[PDB]
Design a protein around this ligand. Structure first.
Ligand SMILES: CC1=C(/C=C/C(C)=C/C=C/C(C)=C/C(=O)O)C(C)(C)CCC1
Length: 137
């Protein structure tokens, strides 16, 4: 699979609900939800090596990882974590996250390329799942 490209969002479900489970307060949620509705996403893939940049007016994240090798990033609400990505299937990667310090909901994320050429991102916090769908610009 080739995840490479500049992606634009076409659907977002359950984002605020995910933030609620993570403990983000009402006003911060309001800010986050508005900014997250129009992200600029850039993915560069070279084999099993990935670079993913997600940008919004209030927060930009850039992660670099190799599938199967542990790395450090942050949860959606901004807490440091150790992550490990694996191929669940040929077109789907799954990432398990572990908080470096403290306790909180168990979080994870998955990215998959669908048969129609789109990209589905899921983010999980305990039992709440956020689903976002993108298409290349
Ligand atoms: C949670 C949160 C914040 C914003 C988060 C944003 C904006 C997340 C965007 C995620 C995207 C854009 C994911 C994707 O689509 O891959 C701010 C900075 C207000 C601080 C309080 C907690």
């Amino acid at each position: 699979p080739n995840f490479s490209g500049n992606w634009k969002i076409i659907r977002s479900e359950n984002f605020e609900e995910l933030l609620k489970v993570l403990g983000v307060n009402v006003m911060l949620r309001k800010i986050a939800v508005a900014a997250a509705s129009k992200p600029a996403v850039e993915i560069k893939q070279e084999g099993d090596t990935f670079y993913i940049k997600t940008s919004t007016t209030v927060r930009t994240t850039e992660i670099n990882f190799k599938v199967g090798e542990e790395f450090e990033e942050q949860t959606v609400d901004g807490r440091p974590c150790k992550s490990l990505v694996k191929w669940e299937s040929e077109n789907k990667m799954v990432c398990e996250q572990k908080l470096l310090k403290g306790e909180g909901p168990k979080t994870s994320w998955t990215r998959e390329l669908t048969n129609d050429g789109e990209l589905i991102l899921t983010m999980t916090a305990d039992d709440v799942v956020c689903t976002r769908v993108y298409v290349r610009e």
